[PDB]
Amino acid sequence: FMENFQKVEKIGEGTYGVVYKARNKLTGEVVALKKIRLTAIREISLLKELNHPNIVKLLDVIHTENKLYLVFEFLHQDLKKFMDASALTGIPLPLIKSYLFQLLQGLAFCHSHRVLHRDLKPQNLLINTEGAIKLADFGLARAFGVPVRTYTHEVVTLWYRAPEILLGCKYYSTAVDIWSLGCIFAEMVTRRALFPGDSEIDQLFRIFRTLGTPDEVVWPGVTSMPDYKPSFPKWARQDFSKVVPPLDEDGRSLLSQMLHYDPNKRISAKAALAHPFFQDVTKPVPHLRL
Numbered sequence: 001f002m003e004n005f006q007k008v009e010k011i012g013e014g015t016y017g018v019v020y021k022a023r024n025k026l027t028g029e030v031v032a033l034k035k036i037r038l039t040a041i042r043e044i045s046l047l048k049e050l051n052h053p054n055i056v057k058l059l060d061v062i063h064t065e066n067k068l069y070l071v072f073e074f075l076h077q078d079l080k081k082f083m084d085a086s087a088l089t090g091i092p093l094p095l096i097k098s099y100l101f102q103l104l105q106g107l108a109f110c111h112s113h114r115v116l117h118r119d120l121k122p123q124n125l126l127i128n129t130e131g132a133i134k135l136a137d138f139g140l141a142r143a144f145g146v147p148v149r150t151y152t153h154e155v156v157t158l159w160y161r162a163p164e165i166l167l168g169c170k171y172y173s174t175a176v177d178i179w180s181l182g183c184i185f186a187e188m189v190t191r192r193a194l195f196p197g198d199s200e201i202d203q204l205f206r207i208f209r210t211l212g213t214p215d216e217v218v219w220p221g222v223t224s225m226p227d228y229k230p231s232f233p234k235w236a237r238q239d240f241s242k243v244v245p246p247l248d249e250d251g252r253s254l255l256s257q258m259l260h261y262d263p264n265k266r267i268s269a270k271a272a273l274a275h276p277f278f279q280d281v282t283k284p285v286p287h288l289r290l
């Protein structure tokens with residue numbers, strides 16, 4: 001158990017719990033060990049079987065005392081750090097394309113098993129030296145949750161949240177992951193966050209100012225959503241040539257479909273993999289300083 005792992009260093013602090021790089025003394029394996037301070041056991045057990053090359057593997061689940069430990073495959077960097085390192089030059093388009101393709105493969109797999117991530121962001125997209133990128137730390141919105149008191153003060157990032165979540169829908173779909181991934185795609189291309197809101201309303205209004213305030217024409221039922229207000233300002237939609245300028249028309253077309261307001265119009269991961277933007281996809285080697 002915990003006695004079977006030698007902590008190497010703390011690699012992260014969160015609302016749920018802290019994550020350490022650690023060595024498994026029985027196997028010699030280097031892992032990420034997440035400690036969560038306190039149905040869930042069963043929902044987590046299911047995640048153990050959700051195995052895919054583009055999903056960070058949940059190796060072990062240890063339930064002991066009032067603590068839950070999740071042992072994950074360890075990767076050496078996240079996309080946030082890689083983007084920051086690449087900010088002067090930009091991630092090359094072929095590598096952006098490869099990462100987007102691989103993440104859509106991971107999403108198509110999880111979504112086909114009815115599992116949503118719900119909280120994609122650059123910090124939960126992990127990369128290795130071979131050119132792979134993997135989805136980490138699937139959120140359990142239906143179960144899980146534990147005390148955050150010991151967990152250091154942590155402001156939840158809203159920048160990648162789909163509009164249906166911000167508008168109060170509680171029974172949202174796999175489409176929320178495509179929205180988040182579209183925001184991340186835009187940020188890799190332009191080297192700036194697409195919608196960096198600092199509150200729920202600022203997040204919503206930044207979306208509206210770029211994509212236009214949604215109405216019943218583009219999003220049937222939007223005006224009946226729980227947090228929709230008729231008093232929302234009415235802004236016009238901007239052109240994607242202005243929004244992600246450097247990007248070609250195949251990329252802009254795909255991004256537009258990933259950012260459709262109506263979750264039933266928003267492209268699925270599976271359909272996205274067939275988009276013409278991926279006609280020339282390859283798997284480049286990233287320049288990773290470790």
Ligand SMILES: C[C@H]1CCCN1C(=O)c1ccc2cnc(NC3CCN(S(C)(=O)=O)CC3)nc2c1
Nearest residue numbers: 032034072073074075076077078081124136137
């Ligand atoms: C995803 C995070 C977001 C907060 C929760 N959570 C994890 O539970 C988690 C799970 C598996 C991991 C595997 N591996 C690593 N490895 C880190 C090495 C250091 N780097 S870095 C800052 O880019 O140098 C980031 C990746 N972390 C993991 C974290």
